[PDB]
From a paper:
The G3BPs are multifunctional RNA-binding proteins with a major regulatory role in the formation of SGs. G3BPs are organized into two globular domains, the Nuclear Transport Factor 2-like (NTF2) and the RNA Recognition Motif (RRM) domains, and structurally disordered regions with low amino acid complexity. However, the major function of G3BP appears to be in the nucleation of SGs, for which it is critical. The alphaviruses target SG responses by sequestering G3BP via two conserved FGDF motifs localized in the C-terminal hypervariable domain (HVD) of nsP3, exemplified for SFV.
Residue numbers in the entry:
A (entry chain B), C (entry chain B): 5 to 135
B (entry chain A), D (entry chain A): 0 to 138
E (entry chain C), F (entry chain C): 449 to 471
Amino acid sequence: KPSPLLVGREFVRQYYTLLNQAPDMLHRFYGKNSSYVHGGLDSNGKPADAVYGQKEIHRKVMSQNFTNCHTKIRHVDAHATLNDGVVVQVMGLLSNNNQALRRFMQTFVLAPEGSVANKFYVHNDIFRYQD
Amino acid sequence: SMVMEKPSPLLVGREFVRQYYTLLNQAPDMLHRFYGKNSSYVHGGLDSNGKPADAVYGQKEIHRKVMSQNFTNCHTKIRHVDAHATLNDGVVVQVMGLLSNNNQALRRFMQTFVLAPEGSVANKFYVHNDIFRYQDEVF
Amino acid sequence: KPSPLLVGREFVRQYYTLLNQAPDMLHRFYGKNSSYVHGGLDSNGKPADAVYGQKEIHRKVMSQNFTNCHTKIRHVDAHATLNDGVVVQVMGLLSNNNQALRRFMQTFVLAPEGSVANKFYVHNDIFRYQD
Amino acid sequence: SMVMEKPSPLLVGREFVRQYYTLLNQAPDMLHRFYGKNSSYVHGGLDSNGKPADAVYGQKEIHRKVMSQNFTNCHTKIRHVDAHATLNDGVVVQVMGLLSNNNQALRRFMQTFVLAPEGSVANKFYVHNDIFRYQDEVF
Amino acid sequence: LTFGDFDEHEVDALASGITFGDF
Amino acid sequence: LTFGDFDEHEVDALASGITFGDF
Ligand SMILES: [K+]
Ligand SMILES: [K+]
Ligand SMILES: [K+]
Ligand SMILES: [K+]
């Protein structure tokens, strides 16, 4: 009954709000079969690779040292995929720790959690800056 | 219990993007054949209000939308392709690059595909979702 | 850059598809210097002879009364000839107007059209049933 | 501006087929001499997968392929020969008939030759393409 | 590996610019 | 009219089964 856009828009609201308010809980959007693919180099200098599941996604989020991270959403697209999922494409700008803005895109695939009605989790998250 | 030549999500996504954009350059009137019924498609654009254009649905609407877009000698520079398994044996593909229509200037784009198996034909995927936006209509 | 087999296989696909869908356009595969040699008797009862060029090939195709003509391709060979041509040998079975199948071979010589890159036309077409 | 004794495509094709198959019957170790460099040759056969065998290229490979085929007292019954001019002064020849090797049973075949002038020696053609398939390996 | 309703090799042939006759 | 690198009359001679000596 909820349209894919009603789901996707509210997801984007909650996700980027939590990224700003409590990044140490962002992993709770994800599940055991989730993949989190945030592209680019750390520094460090090592290349980016997919991390799987809540526990590892939590460790990866914490390694990114998000502080007061702000997002300017410039466009959201959200469509029904198969099996009652929702695919979301976000285009925006992100400022972490009050640093200069950078453009990004982020693709999510949201999947029903199964038991609770209209509960979704993030099955796929692919993020890349456009530098 | 194992299919030892089953293509990985990475190979599916890479070969798909290659086939999609090479076909776009030479035979865009065939692009609609990548899409299933109830597929969603949006390829940038701005409506009369100047807000981004809405998606169309189904191979019929998609064929009409593609042909209204007048792709002619469409050149692409693909910068990043990232492909991962989704649920139900799908593959989600994120694409970033630049696209030039009619030998006009290159325009940066950000795109997501969702590919899904036809249902049973072995190693056959259709495009279920195609979200494409030009950065110059958003940023 | 296209191999002779990439050309020949796609030619066979298009040719026999059009034979089924719109035989009244088959002549558009040919040119003014093309020869079309479909062996055997009409009925009528007159022997077969070569026809030259699109206009006459169109008349000959129409005289054959193709209706819903189906082809079962059993083997295709395609090789580079000189001057960037492609020689194709098809072995198959053909059912016209839902009649019983008959074995055939068909030899084509495909030649570049000259102006457009990777455009070919049928310079030679020799067809015979094996009855 | 006219060569009043230039052989027609029909005569070229007829005499060629005659020479080719009469030589095959009596001196198959000379058959390779009909072929130029970059000639293509396939003469039926099935690979380890049971798919039809691939062509070989060049007079060296061709000589080796012919000698591996062990033609011995090879009898032919030619049923149809059809020969027409191609571009660049070539001749394409379609051949149907039956061939028996080593006094074994006759096998039907379907064959195409492309003949091409050597370059300049007057009324001299080589085999540029030889496609031969036994029907019993296809039908 | 193929996409949509394309046959094996069909995209590669069409994406190479191959065309036939004057249609 | 000749084919390949055969000389005039050479195919006809060889195709007739002509051979010489014990080679
Ligand atoms: K926190
Ligand atoms: K939708
Ligand atoms: K018709
Ligand atoms: K070849």
